[PDB]
């Protein structure tokens, strides 16, 4: 009850996928790991405490900043990619993430402002939490799918490609 469980589970789900790989030479992995860590912080932040109001807003801003890095790099991976099927799939997912993370910023600010205000009912409070939780699950899922496809895409690369990512296997774990 102290820490939201469905937010922590979503963060955990992405952490498991991202920790299948090394961050070295791979930004997408590094940013996805930062995102999973921040989303676990978010599950504590949702239950407001003095000084959590500014932290809730900043945590969502950091999550959105890390998701822009994932989006930006995955778009670069996809354009070079020779397989149309993979290239198209990767581009749809990359496109979705900015919208989801923009919504995370809105809902976090709404939740934080509310915490700051004593009057709101337990219903409005629970509902603002459930909207945040839904967004968090959607975000974690989208990034996880983006990781998978960016790796699949990596196998096929343009001979003349400007940059490459490193995909080295590591033993995954949960935070
Ligand atoms: Na390892």
Here the tokens at position 134 are 């839904």
Give the Cα separation of 151 and 162 in Å (integer). Answer: 17
- Cα–ligand 1 centroid distance for 20 (angstroms): 8
Here the tokens at position 113 are 């402002």
- Cα–ligand 1 centroid distance for 41 (angstroms): 24
3-state secondary structure 6-52: HHHHHHHHHHHHHCCECCCCCHHHHHHHHHHHHHHHHHHHCCCCCCH
Give the Cα separation of 142 and 63 in Å (integer). Answer: 13
The answer for residues whose C-beta is within 8 angstroms of residue 70's C-beta and 6 or more apart is 28, 31, 32, 35, 94, 97, 143, 146
Show the domain range for 37. Answer: 1-175
- Cα–ligand 1 centroid distance for 127 (angstroms): 40
- Write the CATH number for 3: 1.20.120.230
- Cα–ligand 1 centroid distance for 171 (angstroms): 4
The experimental technique used to determine this model is: X-ray
Structural domain count, the chain: 1
């Amino acid at each position: 009850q102290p820490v939201n469980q469905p937010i922590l589970a979503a963060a955990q789900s992405l952490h498991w996928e991202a920790t299948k790989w090394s961050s070295k030479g791979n930004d997408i992995i590094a940013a996805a790991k930062r995102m999973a860590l921040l989303m676990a912080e978010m599950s504590r932040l949702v239950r407001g405490g003095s000084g959590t109001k500014r932290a809730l807003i900043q945590c969502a801003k950091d999550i959105a900043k890390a998701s822009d890095e994932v989006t930006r790099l995955a778009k670069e991976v996809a354009k070079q990619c020779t397989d149309k099927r993979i290239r198209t799939n990767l581009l749809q997912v990359c496109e979705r993430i900015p919208t989801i993370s923009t919504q995370l910023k809105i809902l976090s600010t709404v939740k934080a402002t509310m915490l700051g205000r004593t009057n709101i009912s337990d219903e409005e409070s629970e509902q603002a939490t459930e909207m945040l939780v839904h967004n968090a699950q959607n975000l974690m899922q989208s990034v996880k799918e983006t990781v998978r496809e960016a790796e699949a895409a990596s196998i096929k690369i343009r001979t003349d490609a400007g940059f490459t990512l490193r995909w080295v296997r590591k033993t995954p774990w949960y935070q």
